[PDB]
């Protein structure tokens, strides 16, 4: 309108946007800073970077942009392009890329009392350190630190924002149910805000918004844990197979290779820091070592099973331990022509008797192998069950604190 | 502020930002430069690029921007857009993938005496000569060479603010540890003329990698399969499964070699220790396969077409088995009917002879297996002392 | 009071940066180019792009920006931001992306006689079509092509720089500043002015300056970490000829396993060379050869197994085959008596069948022993030949085969 | 050229201010009617949950300042003016990913002598629509482009859907406009519905920028041929190979190899499925459910083959074949399953001993054969129990997946079709 | 030159770059548009996006920029920043994900008669309807549609420079071969009003792929796996390696699935040719495994449980072997002692009978193996030819 043109011409005749508004030398500008989260896009753990879509609710007072509405047909407020007025260089300090400033420069709203309000939008890529000890059963604590890049506490005073009907300060990230998309991999448990100072430097002050987010591990559970449990079952089973089937090595080595490949195809996802080993990797290493020992003891059992008196002599201690003591505990108890003819028959009989004795000794060796195999079966069933249950119970009891501590 | 509005109006009225801020063209601008490292974004070993997040504090004097506070209500400091005044064109000489100069033209602080302090941010992607010879236990020394581009030392002079870059607010990495860091100023001359120094400041950081991640995710499995390598010599030949185990170990090791090669740069300056040891383990497994194939061939040697040489019998049945202490080795028609019975007896006799020869061959093979197992355990106990 | 201020105000006042500084109608501006390579960042094969860190030195003469030294207290050199001056729009034409112009627009040094000296640094990504034929023992011939994006040969005359009268026909490399790339070695680095005779002098592409980088790959890493493993694994196939041809020998297991390992190496090589369809890399050819040989060895193992496990039931051992393969290449008493006779007869029949089986096994062993020598010879010859032809892929002696000049400082 | 004089009069003589709303009195509202045209659907990469679309935004409003009497100047009936000279409504896609809120190309605006201004810029938008993987690869997605006006509040500008006329009556355009001649259907997705809505949020206040909204919805259906050919049928056939492990005799020492290989191939297909999906945790995808089911079943098959092998190799020297086992596995189940002079004294004593040894060996062998028969019976029973379970599970899961059509009407509670062929009234 | 400085000052003094260059507003500006393809950067079949490097030559006449050379020292041509004069807003209508218009504002040549020549470079990412039916022996036809975005045919009219694009300085792709290229101009009208045409120029390029990378990286391994698959039927059942070999082939092919999936296009419009070939190979291997399992089961059939049906004996032991030309296959205590000897004799008779029956079963299995070997080699050859030669002949 014409009156809007007149008012704008009056307001910006000598107004210099490069000069911070201070009625008197030494005055400070109170700036209210709040955040509204529209979407929590990504939490890339490979680069320790959280991407968010946000609005910044900034408010301050500029004594120069004052007018009397009665003189301008009762215009109570104006929408003025944001580059025409002074604004505090509020930036996200702990960004990962180089983008400090906002992305969308929506125009500010100015009221006749001089109260400037600005709600720019931004796609911010902040940097939060990942605590990789319970991944994927982990909760992260990612912070966004906002402050004026240029002005210090001797020039501006940061404060929290006010609620919709400004009566009390808002000390949280605002979430607008109408415009907010759930991540689907993370759930927001706490979202406080707080002003932080530094003891050594009295010119520092910032407003930090904290996001405590808990991961939903269904994807990892299915796609990594379930196959690993199946592989461990096969590793235990290897000790029920009979050594004569000639398939112990196939089964055990297949399990070992499968679990190793599952470990390899997980560096694409697990974070690359070195302050701890994530619980999933610890479980995979545990299963890998268990299967390797399964391979070793399968080799030992086969070696025992394929012995014979022509090659080995059973020592007393093996007989005492495996033939006598263990089995009850494991419930695994068990004329010249006629002269030539007679000589041939006697030779045949002697050969058969010798073969019988040989076979009895060989069967003793095979029984030792059977008993050792059964013992190993029980031992590894116990070990695998206890270890798996312990690891996943420890993982389960990992929840964010009820008090955000900020 | 009316006072500050008037001050800014007067300061920039007759001010040209293209001209050096000196009171005589013979003098030089003295710029104090300090580098403050905020974060170590990344170290790309394959590409050899170190991405760091930094602030570049620069201080100098511009006598054209001084004012008397008494005339302006007592204002002693202001903030001005860096685009409004003369700025030193400080450039990163060894830039690799980023921006050579500062591109975030933030505001700068100006005193009433003309003292300008300007601390813009930057992402420096500088070239880093990565020495992959002790990977993953390596330490890296790569730098950031900063210098004024178009002005020589007689026009614009740069000096480091302090002996070392500022890491007061450094964010702990989680992949690297800062062992040391220092900055040095270099004068450079040319055969042209010795009265025109060219100055630069090189900052360098010594970074010690934290090896836990690579150890756990790469070395442990490789050691596990290397250990499983020698186990094949305990598997009896009758099980008919030696080749399965040996070849599985071979395949696993080659996969891990693939991982290693795609984890390090392709430079030929030095041979990585991890790669050398992986190649040696691969040779080790190949020898394992060849020798176990020899053992298998011996075990099934047919007594009909092969007769045991005397030296083999002596060595492998008369002397070595005694040496192994801890082992458990050993050391009408009635005439037709009569003729048939005699034939059966003779056939059993010949079969017994052939068998006895076969078990002699099998015993030789088993002895060779024990010898190779002992050799493998000896190599293992030698290896476990190497890490200590 | 800085006199540079009033000097520069005099110079730039009444100066139009859109006008080429031609004194008269037929004047042609001599634009002089020189290149200083400071770091050979990379050579990406997948996207066929060479990435280098260079300083490009461009010199010309702008008669407007001239003054008299005595009038300005002896000032004989000023620095003017390049955004305020006329520049010859010299750009790198063979750029993979859209980045034509320089990275950092540095100031220009202006001397009192009008000489303009501009030394912007740049990170240039240029197209370098690769010849994979001799990978990894290959050498590459990359080119940086510079030409004016705006002015033709009737307005601007591109030339190479000259110090002390001698033309600088090479990429300048300062031993102190330069850092070797480890993965590559710079063998030749000539420069020359080229003309596109298919065009005329009014086409903006008639003239160009080409700087050449001939780079030889250092292969020690590639050898140690790809070839030696691959050769060692592929040599295992010949071992199948010593395993027994019966259950538990595991001939097929070993053969197929070596074949799969070779396939894995082939894949590894796949993601290391351009997806172009002009030639097959040398190492790729070697891998194809060993895969084919191992397939043949699998077939031979199957045939040997089939021969060795034959019995009188199925196949009749011809006397011709036997000779060829074993002579050239290498009341109550009546019942009791009847029972005894039957037992003897049955035992003898069984033994004869066993003897026939043994003969078949021997034939199998002989075939196996012959095919072992055949396969070992084939594999060794193929490996040696392929890697010897790889190792004799020398870089040419001269940068341009026709010329006799060496093109070095 | 009269256009120069006219534009000078409009922008310079009248002192046009491009930073002031086009309203005579500063309490009225500017009605911006906006519509959307879909030039083509580029991609819906599911891993990052992004919809990349090429659209044309049609804005239309009134500006009383850009009016002129066509006769006073030459008969100029239309002007083209760059958008940097006139007031423009900054309407932004609020739910984007890459930080591109604005249109890509700022074309000229067309101004009519009555003040009507129309602006049709093209844009490339990367919006965020979450993926519902419940029925992947037989799924359909419901993505949204939400446009808001953040520069003015609802009391200053009112967004609306563009209207159109057919026979003298005007109706809103409540759909994304697709030009049938120019539009090329996407390779992987098929558009089913494309409504357009203007949304009010009454719990907010009109003196704010979060009160209005205009949302264009794309309901799309995946064409499941790539995944049916490259993922589903290879996996199904390789899984059915598991049943054959029971028809393989235990003498051929290769049962466990077959079963384990089937399991490993299934693990490969699991890897692919993981690689092709986002990390969400709302539900397990259909193909994921099938893979879990079949992998558990094949693990059971491996365990059962192991048990069969353990039974097959029992011998009288280590185990006792009880009468219960004989009755169960050799009489009942095979029927139910329709299964098919001292010298002469020394000679006499020696031959008697030979006969005794042979008889004992024969008894040993026949008991071994009985154990073998028991093993075969267990094999057959397992095959019968497991094969139908596998087949029925596969069929059930995949038909349930194939019966997942889109709901045939967007906005379930609404009886309107939002089709370009049946405008309201 | 002072002459050129004065000329450029005079030309742009009273120049408004937002007005069309026409004497009268009812006229139109004739623009000659030509396309110069410099490089074919890439083609993306999954997303249907063709990325090309081009130059967009445009010529027109600006009446306001005439001058008389005699008054300016004989200057006849100059170069001006394109930002300083009126430009036609040429837009790529079918842009996929690149820039819609020209963004590299280079300089343009201006003659003393007002003739303006402007050749800006561009990176066009166009939407390309890709057909994968014959991949990798596929021929792709897709276009670049150009037109003036905001002006109709009565204000700015565009005409093609030539009948086809210019490929004089076209680099060689190394993955595609330019079979053909042309350009056409279309008028378009709307039911509104027929006095207002809307023009455009479509440049289409017909390309043919160089199918060597895909062959040597996909097809050859498929053939090798197919051959090894049929190789299993010559392996005797006694060697416990039939399932080992066949299953190893199957797993290797399954792993090859990874490579093929990452390489081949992932569209759902139609089944690629190599898609059909790979599905055929998978079914081939699986069928071989099933039949091998059946053969192995047959070879171990015991006479105790199974009795050979008459038809099996008639077919596989009498009929088929005769007609198999290629193979060489064949076509007191004394009473106790006496009783024991009789028992041994009768047991040996029974063992001989059982062994003969089992031997017959083994023979049947071997004959089935031979038949399947021939049939499977034939099927492999026929399937490969049927899949590929049908398209290959058309080339
Ligand atoms: C330069 O200036 C000096 C002194 O101001 C004067 O004598 C001389 O003529 C001028 N011109 C030249 C070319 O030196
Ligand atoms: C006169 C009795 C002869 C018995 C021969 C038994 C042969 C068993 C191998």
Author numbering:
A (entry chain C): 1 to 334, 398 to 469
B (entry chain D): 1 to 331, 370 to 426
C (entry chain E): 1 to 330, 411 to 489
D (entry chain B): 2 to 341, 416 to 500
E (entry chain A): 1 to 331, 370 to 433
Task: Show me the paper's own sentences about this structure.
Nicotinic acetylcholine receptors on muscle fibers are inhibited by many general anesthetics and are the principal targets of neuromuscular blockers used in surgery. The receptor assembles as a pentamer from four homologous subunits arranged α-γ–α–δ–β pseudo-symmetrically around the channel axis. The large extracellular domain (ECD) harbors the classical neurotransmitter binding sites at α–γ and α–δ interfaces. The transmembrane domain (TMD) of four α-helices per subunit forms a pore lined by the M2 helices.
Further focused classification revealed two distinct states of the receptor, one with rocuronium bound in the pore and one without. Both structures contained clear density for rocuronium in both classical neurotransmitter sites, with loop C propped open by the ligand and the ECD in an expanded conformation characteristic of antagonist-bound and apo Cys-loop receptors. In contrast, the second conformation of the rocuronium-bound receptor stabilizes a conformation intermediate between the resting and desensitized states. However, the density for rocuronium is remarkably clear, revealing only one possible orientation and set of interactions. Its binding deep in the pore causes the extracellular ends of all five M2 helices to dilate or tilt away from the channel axis. The largest movement occurs in M2 of the αγ subunit, which rocuronium packs against most closely. The M4 of the αγ subunit detaches from the receptor in a manner similar to that in the carbachol-bound desensitized state, wherein only M4 of the αδ subunit is detached. The tightest constriction in the pore is at the 2ʹ residue T244, a position also associated with the desensitized state constriction. Thus, despite the extracellular domain adopting an antagonist-bound conformation, the transmembrane domain appears to be locked in a conformation reminiscent of agonist-bound desensitized states. Could pore block contribute meaningfully to the paralytic action of rocuronium? This site is likely too low in affinity to be relevant in a clinical setting, however the structure shows how a representative blocker binds and thereby stabilizes a unique receptor conformation where the ECD is in a resting-like state, while the TMD resembles a desensitized-like state.
